[PDB]
Amino acid sequence: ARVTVQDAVEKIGNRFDLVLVAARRARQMQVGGKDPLVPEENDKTTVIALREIEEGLINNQILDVRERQEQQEQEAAELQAVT
Amino acid sequence: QDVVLGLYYMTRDCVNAKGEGMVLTGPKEAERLYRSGLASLHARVKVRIT
Amino acid sequence: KPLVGTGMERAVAVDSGVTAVAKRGGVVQYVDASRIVIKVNEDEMYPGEAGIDIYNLTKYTRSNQNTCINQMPCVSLGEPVERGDVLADGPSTDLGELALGQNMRVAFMPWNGYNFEDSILVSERVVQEDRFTTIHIQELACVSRDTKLGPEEITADIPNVGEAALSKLDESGIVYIGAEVTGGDILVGKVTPKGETQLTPEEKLLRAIFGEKASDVKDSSLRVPNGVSGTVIDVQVFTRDGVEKDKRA
Amino acid sequence: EIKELLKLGDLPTSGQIRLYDGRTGEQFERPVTVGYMYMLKLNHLVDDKM
Amino acid sequence: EFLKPRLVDIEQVSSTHAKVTLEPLERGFGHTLGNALRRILLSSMPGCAVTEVEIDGVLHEYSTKEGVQEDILEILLNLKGLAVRVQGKDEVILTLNKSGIGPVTAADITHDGDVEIVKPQHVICHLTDENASISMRIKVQRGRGYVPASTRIPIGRLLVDACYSPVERIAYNVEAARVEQRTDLDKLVIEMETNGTIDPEEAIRRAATILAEQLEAFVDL
Amino acid sequence: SVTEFLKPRLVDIEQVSSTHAKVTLEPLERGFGHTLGNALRRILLSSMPGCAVTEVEIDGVLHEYSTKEGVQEDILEILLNLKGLAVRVQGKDEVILTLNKSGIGPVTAADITHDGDVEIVKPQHVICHLTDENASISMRIKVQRGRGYVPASTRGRLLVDACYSPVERIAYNVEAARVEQRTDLDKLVIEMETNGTIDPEEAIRRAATILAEQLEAFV
Amino acid sequence: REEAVVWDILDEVIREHPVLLNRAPTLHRLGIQAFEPVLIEGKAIQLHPLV
């Protein structure tokens, strides 16, 4: 359910990086490879992204940690299946 | 423009109406009195608000 | 008939020549929906040139703003009419008065927000009676220009379509009068010399000696615009004098 | 003269008639103006502007 | 216990309109059933108005016919005003044939005896010449509500808008029923206007049938 | 076809606590949402069987605009508390009850004696508060079954507004919903509280039962 | 052709996809606000009155 964005703005108090964080996350859920952390109510990926922000479990820092973790996982497959 | 006319007609009072000066347990039965026609929409009344 | 009028409706109706004012008064001999034939009274009559007044009404046809101009006989059969009296009510006229809109039962109250700023909330009794239902008329032309690789045919032989469009075209390729067309149909089938190859002068000598034509073609038919429906009520065909005529012409 | 013509009909001289609602079936307060206005259809049609 | 009403009086005050009387009602149910039955009588009553007209020597409805003073479109609106009962069918094709000078009434149609023409004085058009004649096939079908031309949609078969609604105006008025040696009982009196093809008892009975179904949606009958 | 309608069925009860429910009906013929919601509203708000507190006489009171010591509240506000006492009663039509207490603290509905066929939906319904040990309350309270609402002006005995009907709020929101090729329909959204003496969906079935029984001599 | 299944497809691509309304003399920044669509059998843009 979506009417406002206000709690997401109160957790990330910039209102201009809310768009960027939710855009990066909704790309991770659209193209995207990943799967949503919140159960979807047959929503678009935009609302699921803002909904994950409203739970306070996604910011820029969680995305940076998980991208570093995926970049570290991208050597433990190649270096294992080559050598 | 329409909604402020609706409110200004709603929250006003006249010196005599249906149910002038009766006492009510709360706004829910105020609506229950208004929709039956037993009280007029502008009639000064003690209710219990919270 | 505007119930609240000012009396100047008569002057606007009579003076603006969209009604058929009788030149010489007399007696209705014959009213049809298209002409009105009046026998003339004696004291307004000329001794030679015996004379009856024949008023040909102008029926359903296009106005300059794509509205419908139409005259209707407002007199009976065999009725005394006077000189200067109207014989046919034109568009927006009623018995020689002036009647633009229609007069309706109006009420001044807010009704649940549906007439908020200046909006107007209308019953279904209005749209059931067809009392604002009006008639608009579009004139669609198709021109056949003399172009390169030969001029263009208006034949029904149209590439890449079948009987789905040809079911409403005749032997000549022009739509029947009365066809209830919608958006996307084909009204006048026009076809073009397609192929656009620009063969070489060597290939030009090749096709000039060995004698092979191109015989490819593209649809460029006159189609109905988007969204509109209606009824073909009139088809006019004009032809340059040095051009032969097909069968519907 | 408008009042005298309304008295020639059997209509009220006030010009205002009490009206019911088609939804609730109950009388509106404060009786309202009904009449015949000669309304025009202008040719700014929405299926030309859309 | 709640007391239950009965159809007590049907005053056929004219051929068009008549007044029923519902009696006796508990206090409060008068306006409730009155508004509900006004709603159902105006909304959904099965009418039998005209649907498709096919004049013989006429292509499309925006033309004229040599020998009749009204246009084809005015003939179609005059047919749209025609009320007609059918009894044992759903659709039917009537047939009008007339020549000579004189007003073409609705009585000139071929009878087709289960089809009743409820108003013979209703003119369609006026023929205007001796050697002039119209001949149309009038396709009338049973229907409900208002179905215009553009929703449900040869080149000769013209289409009129369908106006399947046999009522015109419903006017219920409650009043106190001083009866049963008991005061404070309502009396519902519905003045219903009809084009002529509906018995007012059958009208109010179809309406109460409709309400019984709409409440059968969630209660056991 | 002319008799065949779109007969709905209720799709959910998106409820809050057991005296309240939000019932939706979908989908309906165009124009039936208002007549069904309005008919059920007038029947639930006007004519519902139910018992209610009707007339109360206090021990030492001869006038409403008065007081009695040991009572933090007033007489008029204790009658406001007595209006909300939602009471179900078995096959007895009407019966008189009494209430006696001397103590310090609230007076709840569990202080009322059980005697008779009288059952209270909430003992927690606080009638009044007391402040003095020697402050002894003694009131006689008469319940009576009826048919909806009868005020005090349309009736030491005191005149209590009689609210027999169990519902306390009914409102509907006819909003539009669609079928596949159909244009426009209705979605009746009933929102309703009770007083506790009946659960809401049974009260809607009461309203439908009464409106069905009032049409039996027609169909 | 506007077949029967494209309208459920359309209701499932509307659901959370905003649009931008815009009046023609757009003076200040409230002249472009973004809404959510509700579909209409009609040809006129319905617009919430307080806006």
Swiss-Prot record, chain A:
It catalyses: RNA(n) + a ribonucleoside 5'-triphosphate = RNA(n+1) + diphosphate. Keywords: DNA-directed RNA polymerase, Nucleotidyltransferase, Transcription, Transferase. InterPro entries: DNA-dir_RNA_pol_omega (IPR003716), Pol_omega/Rpo6/RPB6 (IPR006110), RPB6/omega-like_sf (IPR036161). The keyword Nucleotidyltransferase applies. The keyword Transcription applies. SUPFAM superfamilies: RPB6/omega subunit-like (SSF63562). Gene3D superfamilies: 3.90.940.10. Its EC number is 2.7.7.6. Coiled coil: none annotated. It is an enzyme of class 2 (transferase). One of its GO terms (cellular component) is cytosol. GO terms for molecular function: bacterial-type RNA polymerase core enzyme binding; DNA binding; DNA-directed RNA polymerase activity. It holds the Pfam family RNA_pol_Rpb6. GO terms for biological process: bacterial-type flagellum assembly; bacterial-type flagellum-dependent cell motility; cell motility; cellular response to cell envelope stress; DNA-templated transcription initiation; intracellular iron ion homeostasis; nitrate assimilation; protein-containing complex assembly. Promotes RNA polymerase (RNAP) assembly. Latches the N- and C-terminal regions of the beta' subunit thereby facilitating its interaction with the beta and alpha subunits. Part of the processive rRNA transcription and antitermination complex (rrnTAC). The complex forms an RNA-chaperone ring around the RNA exit tunnel of RNAP. It supports rapid transcription and antitermination of rRNA operons, cotranscriptional rRNA folding, and annealing of distal rRNA regions to allow correct ribosome biogenesis. NCBIfam families: rpoZ.
Curated annotation (Swiss-Prot), chain C:
Acetylated on several lysine residues in the presence of glucose. It comes from the Bacteria. Co-administration of salinamide and rifampicin or salinamide and myxopyronin suppresses the emergence of resistance to both antibiotics. Belongs to the RNA polymerase beta chain family. DNA-dependent RNA polymerase (RNAP) catalyzes the transcription of DNA into RNA using the four ribonucleoside triphosphates as substrates. Resistance to the antibiotics salinamide A, salinamide B, rifampicin, streptolydigin, CBR703, myxopyronin, and lipiarmycin can result from mutations in this protein. The RNAP catalytic core consists of 2 alpha, 1 beta, 1 beta' and 1 omega subunit. When a sigma factor is associated with the core the holoenzyme is formed, which can initiate transcription. The rRNA transcription and antitermination complex (rrnTAC) consists of RNAP, NusA, NusB, NusE (rpsJ), NusG, SubB, ribosomal protein S4, DNA and precursor rRNA; S4 is more flexible than other subunits. In pull-down experiments interacts with CedA. (Microbial infection) Interacts (via flap domain) with Escherichia phage lambda antitermination protein Q; this interaction renders bacterial RNAP resistant to transcription pausing and allows it to read through termination signals. The chain holds residues 697 to 945 of 1342 of the full protein.
From Swiss-Prot, chain E:
Residues 1-221 are annotated as: Alpha N-terminal domain (alpha-NTD). It comes from the Bacteria. Keywords: Acetylation, ADP-ribosylation, DNA-directed RNA polymerase, Nucleotidyltransferase, Transcription, Transferase. Its EC number is 2.7.7.6. One of its GO terms (biological process) is intracellular iron ion homeostasis. GO terms for molecular function: DNA binding; DNA-directed RNA polymerase activity; protein dimerization activity. It is an enzyme of class 2 (transferase). GO terms for cellular component: cytoplasm; cytosol; cytosolic DNA-directed RNA polymerase complex; membrane; transcription elongation factor complex. It catalyses: RNA(n) + a ribonucleoside 5'-triphosphate = RNA(n+1) + diphosphate. (Microbial infection) ADP-ribosylated on both alpha subunits by the phage T4 protein ModA. ADP-ribosylated on only one of the alpha subunits by the phage T4 protein Alt. The keyword Nucleotidyltransferase applies. Belongs to the RNA polymerase alpha chain family. Homodimer. The RNAP catalytic core consists of 2 alpha, 1 beta, 1 beta' and 1 omega subunit. When a sigma factor is associated with the core the holoenzyme is formed, which can initiate transcription. Both the N- and C-terminus interact with different regions of transcriptional regulator CRP. The rRNA transcription and antitermination complex (rrnTAC) consists of RNAP, NusA, NusB, NusE (rpsJ), NusG, SubB, ribosomal protein S4, DNA and precursor rRNA; S4 is more flexible than other subunits. This is DNA-directed RNA polymerase subunit alpha. It comes from Escherichia coli (strain K12). The chain holds residues 7 to 234 of 329 of the full protein.
UniProtKB/Swiss-Prot annotation, chain G:
Acetylated on several lysine residues in the presence of glucose. Co-administration of salinamide and rifampicin or salinamide and myxopyronin suppresses the emergence of resistance to both antibiotics. DNA-dependent RNA polymerase (RNAP) catalyzes the transcription of DNA into RNA using the four ribonucleoside triphosphates as substrates. Belongs to the RNA polymerase beta' chain family. The RNAP catalytic core consists of 2 alpha, 1 beta, 1 beta' and 1 omega subunit. When a sigma factor is associated with the core the holoenzyme is formed, which can initiate transcription. The rRNA transcription and antitermination complex (rrnTAC) consists of RNAP, NusA, NusB, NusE (rpsJ), NusG, SubB, ribosomal protein S4, DNA and precursor rRNA; S4 is more flexible than other subunits. This is DNA-directed RNA polymerase subunit beta'. The chain holds residues 403 to 453 of 1407 of the full protein.
